[PDB]
Symmetry: C2
Subunit: 115 residues, 2 copies
Amino acid sequence: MKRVITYGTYDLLHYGHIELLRRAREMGDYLIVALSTDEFNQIKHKKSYYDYEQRKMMLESIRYVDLVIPEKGWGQKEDDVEKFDVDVFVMGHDWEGEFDFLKDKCEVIYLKRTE
Amino acid sequence: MKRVITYGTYDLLHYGHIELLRRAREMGDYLIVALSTDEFNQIKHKKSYYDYEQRKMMLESIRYVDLVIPEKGWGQKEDDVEKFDVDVFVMGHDWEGEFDFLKDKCEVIYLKR
């Protein structure tokens, strides 16, 4: 089972996010989304319109989302990848290079048309 | 196959919507969503942030939604129900009584809170 993962806040979803998620899920057989908690969301210098729970509920309702886990901080990726047996790590193009350090643990992929 | 249908604009799509949709789909085996076209939105003194296509794509991505069709006007429901062999018609509480005329063609249900 090729397991894919992606991180993000996913606050006011606009079809743009759905496209990213679908493409991500498309690269495996199972997609995990590490949803930024409201505390970390704050750390990221944001104050989401929708709270974690609500954002989680919406993501879970999306056909392409198989599991939503909480992203509580910057240094949990490496651990997540191992803990959840992640095969592919996907992020938007605007993160290109930012997570290459995971390349030795899994397939790192930066999408294209991800404004 | 118990086919359910519901109408609406579903613009800035979030969980409140999801709640209604899931509940709706829950009453049958297949859920149809008649998405208000952008033209029909103006007719309802409403202007969406997301255009019909984008709203449609988002709905389609929701596990509870099996089909999205365009709602072009106020008087297509009776027709839709027949044309799509709709068994149950669902709408939010705020529409209670407003579509009872369909009761003779299908099960009309107004969700609570």
